[PDB]
Design a binder for this molecule. Structure first.
Ligand SMILES: *[C@@H]1O[C@H](CO)[C@@H](O[C@@H]2O[C@H](CO)[C@@H](O[C@@H]3O[C@H](CO)[C@@H](O)[C@H](O)[C@@H]3O)[C@H](O)[C@H]2NC(C)=O)[C@H](O)[C@H]1NC(C)=O
Ligand SMILES: *[C@@H]1O[C@H](CO)[C@@H](O[C@@H]2O[C@H](CO)[C@@H](O)[C@H](O)[C@H]2NC(C)=O)[C@H](O)[C@H]1NC(C)=O
Ligand SMILES: *[C@@H]1O[C@H](CO)[C@@H](O)[C@H](O)[C@H]1NC(C)=O
Lengths: 112, 225, 97
């Protein structure tokens, strides 16, 4: 039905520009977070930006949770990006709100 | 009796100063730090003194750490201290947990904690003897005694502040001297959490509902064309 | 225009000491003779007396068991008539210059 319009929207360059902007701001967040002052202080901007980034990544996974896995299960870059999404979503899901047993932190800069 | 020439010292082989956190040249003129209402119940406030203490030890959050104490006679290092000792807070904060809770430490005589009232070599009777009339009301009550033959430490909190550990040597067979000292540590954590009741999954489902609403709004965009 | 072997550090002085310039500013109008002496000596190895100042300034409490030598600027030639005085508060009863 509306799958043609959805594919036209995802082929539009504005969504790509927006998502590129969000992940470049994530790159700048990592650049500022490799420091110590912005790591835990003056970090309300860090919190709201990270919430925006995980919202954008959830939206991207919702776009890739379509019937397109029939091609995202045999291709090249496609399987790589969906696996990247999975091994992004799961670790910060069990890390940012952990409440569990774990050794220490070694996958924050790795996730970024 | 006691030997008056003995004293206990806590090592400070690397201090928090002389790098990009704090400098020694500034603390002595009333460099006063904050307590975020976590000791007893309000606007508590602590005054570090450089002349009394100096540059405090630096520690990190969620790191199993113990202080290593040396015994001094006539101002001379002779032997690191090995007996059982306890720590306390003069300000009265609880924002730090302990290691293995005396169960894997093979305690058997219901070890007393920091609730019986000041601990010293007189009031203390250990829990590794075979006292017969108080074995356990204790699945996992912690072990507020460090050093000795056990291997339990302090896990630190995320307060990101200065701590003034009041340390007392506790074993009544090391000496008649009430060995006591006060030293200063400072924790450097990673990240405070202000997420509250909105979870990651909660924000996820909020975003899914909003995206489905956007899809239901964009369906008439195709319908009208 | 004069310096010495070493600095405030590399000599074991944990805390801040007192130098010639510091004592000259300390004493406003009295001549240089009464500025410093054993009647006003306080050690650098204190942790309790004077100051946790910055470390790295030139150090002139030179003595034996230290290698501390004198130094002059390399370029111009000149003479600097120096009088040496012992600073120890409890060595001898008199003045020795
Ligand atoms: C400090 O040590 C004392 C022992 O001298 C501890 O008191 C004992 O604590 C245990 C576990 O907390 C109690 O066992 C259980 O208590 C709960 C109620 O909290 C009850 O529902 C269970 O059925 C079981 O009885 C034990 O009764 C209690 N004994 C006494 C005499 O109070 C104390 O908890 C320790 N506190 C700290 C902070 O380590
Ligand atoms: C100050 O300069 C003197 C140069 O006169 C240096 O003296 C040397 O010190 C070493 C270390 O004990 C001796 O082995 C040499 O024999 C000394 N040489 C001379 C010519 O005296 C001294 O190292 C300098 N001090 C500092 C802190 O750099
Ligand atoms: C800090 O305390 C010292 C002595 O306790 C006092 O001389 C000084 O004025 C105080 N400074 C401030 C800012 O409170």
């Amino acid at each position: 039905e509306c799958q043609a319009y959805f594919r036209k929207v995802i082929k539009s360059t504005f969504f790509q520009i927006v998502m590129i902007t969000t992940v470049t701001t994530n790159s700048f967040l990592l650049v500022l977070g490799t420091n110590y002052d912005i790591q835990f202080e003056f970090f309300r901007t860090f919190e709201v930006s990270e919430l925006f980034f995980v919202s954008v990544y959830v939206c991207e996974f919702l776009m890739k949770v379509y019937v397109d896995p029939i091609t995202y299960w045999k291709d090249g870059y496609n399987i790589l990006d969906v696996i990247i999404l999975i091994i992004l979503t799961i670790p910060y899901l069990l890390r940012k709100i952990k409440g569990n047993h774990s050794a220490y932190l070694h996958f924050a800069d790795g996730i970024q | 009796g006691c030997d008056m020439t003995k004293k206990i010292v806590v090592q400070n082989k690397i201090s928090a100063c002389t790098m990009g956190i704090l400098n020694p040249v500034q603390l002595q003129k009333n460099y006063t730090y904050t307590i975020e209402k976590e000791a007893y119940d309000d606007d508590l406030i602590v005054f570090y003194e450089y002349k009394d203490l100096g540059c405090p030890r630096l520690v990190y959050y969620d790191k199993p750490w113990k202080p290593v104490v040396e015994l001094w006679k006539n101002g001379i290092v002779e032997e690191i201290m090995n007996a059982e000792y306890v720590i306390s807070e003069i300000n009265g904060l609880v924002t730090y947990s302990y290691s293995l809770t005396a169960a894997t430490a093979n305690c058997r005589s219901q070890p007393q904690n920091w609730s019986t009232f000041l601990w010293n070599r007189e009031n203390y009777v250990s829990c590794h003897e075979d006292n017969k009339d108080n074995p356990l009301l204790w699945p996992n009550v912690e072990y507020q005694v460090l050093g000795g033959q056990t291997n339990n430490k302090i896990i630190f909190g995320q307060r990101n502040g200065i701590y003034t550990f009041h340390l007392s040597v506790v074993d009544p067979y090391y000496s008649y001297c009430n060995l006591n000292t006060i030293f200063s540590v400072y924790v450097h954590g990673a990240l405070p959490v202000t997420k509250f009741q909105p979870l990651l999954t909660i924000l996820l489902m909020v975003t899914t509902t909003l995206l489905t609403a956007w899809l239901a709004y964009a369906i008439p965009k195709q319908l009208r064309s | 225009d004069y310096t010495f072997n070493s600095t405030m550090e590399q000599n074991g002085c944990i805390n801040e000491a007192q130098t010639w310039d510091s004592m000259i500013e300390e004493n406003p109008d009295i001549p240089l003779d009464d500025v410093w002496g054993p009647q006003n000596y306080r050690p650098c190895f204190s942790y309790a007396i004077g100051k946790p100042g910055d470390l790295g300034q030139p150090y002139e409490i030179l003595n034996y068991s230290n290698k501390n030598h004198i130094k002059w600027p390399m370029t111009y030639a000149g003479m600097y008539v120096y009088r040496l005085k012992i600073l120890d508060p409890n060595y001898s009863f008199c003045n020795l210059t």
